[PDB]
C-alpha cells in the first residue's frame, strides 16, 4: 500500500499490531478471565506496546 513494509512481520510476531485479547479467539479470552483466579494464561501472550 504505502504502509511500512515490516508491518506484516511485526503484526504476526507481536512487536506491533493488536493486543492479545483482540488477536486471540473470543472463546479463549473468556476462558482466561474465568480461570484467572487460579490458572493465569496472561503471561503466555504478548501485548504490543508502541
Amino acid at each position: 500500500m504505502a504502509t511500512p513494509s515490516m508491518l506484516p512481520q511485526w503484526a504476526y510476531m507481536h512487536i506491533a499490531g493488536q493486543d492479545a485479547s483482540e488477536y486471540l479467539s473470543p472463546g479463549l479470552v473468556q476462558f482466561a478471565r474465568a480461570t484467572d483466579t487460579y490458572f493465569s494464561l496472561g503471561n503466555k501472550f504478548r501485548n504490543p506496546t508502541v
Partner: peptide, 11 residues
C-alpha cells in the same frame, strides 16, 4: 533494569 511495559491483558 526496566524493560517492556505490562505484557498481560487487562482482564
Amino acid at each position: 533494569d526496566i524493560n517492556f511495559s505490562s505484557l498481560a491483558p487487562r482482564h
